[PDB]
Amino acid sequence: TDAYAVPLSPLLSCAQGIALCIMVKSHYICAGRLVRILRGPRQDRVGVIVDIVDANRVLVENPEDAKMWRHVQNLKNVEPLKYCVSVSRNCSAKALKDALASSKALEKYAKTRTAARVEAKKACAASTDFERYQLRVARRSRAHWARKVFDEKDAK
């Protein structure tokens, strides 16, 4: 019995995680800049990375306002974003995680895209059975209206 993401929709796929990871050298991906964690008990949060300790393991934190502690989260559920603060080209791994994040790099990302999908899938998990109707009359609307537009294309 297959849940699908096409192509090649998948048998026997647990709906509580994925084996996303493809191996990469640690240094290029991340450097005490910023990252987000897919699979954590706190779910899909982003915390700027304080430092790298050993290999897979990282120390991941965030200033406040998210109930995110300074903690040891592993790269196996911690995946970089290109909204860095202190990785790569910028001269150093920075300190004062709030002030460096007071450069709105998180505030910009939290209001930019790929975070409107984080809460999208978290909205479809808190949508009670009334907004699921709202979502179905919303798709059904855009659906047939799409068909009306196709009819217009046929006319053209």
Partner: protein
């Protein structure tokens, strides 16, 4: 998440009917439990002090608190036994967060490559490294 907490176990030798005030022995051991700390408390004193767990009493075993969770270096002078080259010590400088964390990696490395497990392994000098 790393097992094998760090215990501070201290104890006299049941004072005494002979010496009436035997010197107190304290040492810090990494162990899953504190029953396993006292079990290896009374192995040092049975060996390094010739004191039985029977003829002595444990004063106050204690769980060391923590260090502010932040990555740092650790050289752990570790001494294991094996039919694989009996009683060799080692250094194996690890880079983990806490002493509990790095010594965990120490055990999971020896049991990984020398198959030496918890009771065949003594630990000494779990200290840190600036550079």
């Amino acid at each position: 998440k790393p097992h094998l907490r760090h215990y501070q176990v201290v104890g006299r030798e049941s004072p005494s009917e002979k010496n009436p005030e035997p010197t107190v022995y304290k040492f810090e051991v990494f162990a899953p439990n504190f029953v396993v700390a006292k079990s290896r408390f009374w192995r040092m004193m049975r060996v390094k002090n010739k004191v039985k767990a029977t003829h002595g009493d444990v004063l106050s075993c204690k769980v060391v608190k923590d260090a502010k969770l932040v990555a740092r270096n650790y050289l752990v002078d570790i001494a294991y036994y094996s039919q694989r080259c009996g009683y060799t010590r080692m250094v194996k400088e690890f880079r983990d967060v806490s002493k509990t964390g790095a010594v965990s990696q120490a055990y999971h490395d020896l049991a990984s490559r020398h198959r030496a497990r918890y009771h065949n392994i003594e630990v000494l000098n779990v200290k840190s490294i600036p550079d």
